[PDB]
Amino acid sequence: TSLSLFYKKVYRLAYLRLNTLCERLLSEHPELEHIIWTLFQHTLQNEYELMRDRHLDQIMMCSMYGICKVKNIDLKFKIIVTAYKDLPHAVQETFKRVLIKEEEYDSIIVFYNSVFMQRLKTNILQYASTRPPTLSPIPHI
C-alpha cells in the first residue's frame, strides 16, 4: 500500500514528463508514447535496481531512445536531451553526469549503451514485431 502509493506517484510524474517530451518530439508517430511508457513502467517495476543512485528522467530518456531505435524512427539522443532541458525542473547534469559502473560517471549515452540497453535489450526487441503490443495502462491523472 505505502509502496503502491509511492509507485503510483512515481508513475504519474514519469508519465507526465514522458508525455511532454513525446508531444514535442514524436508529434507524428503518436503510437510510440504508449509503447515507450510500457518499457519505462516495466523498468521501474521490474528492473528497479537501474534506479539505484540514479534519476527517473534518465530511465525516461533511455526508454524513449530505445523504442524509437527498434521502430526505426529517426530520433537522436542529442535531440531528446535538448528537448529535456526545457522541462521546468530540468538540469543538464542529469544527462551529462550519470552513474555508470561502481563510481564511474559518464554521459547518459554511456549509461544507455553500457547499462540500460544491455539490461533491457530483450524487452526492447519485443517491439520489433508487428503483432499488437500488450501495453501498460496509462497512469491516472
Binding site: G66, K69, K76, F77, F95, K96, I108, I109, Y112, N113
Partner: peptide, 9 residues
C-alpha cells in the same frame, strides 16, 4: 541495432 552512435555535444 539498439546502439547509440552519438557523443554528447
Amino acid at each position: 541495432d539498439l546502439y547509440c552512435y552519438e557523443q554528447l555535444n
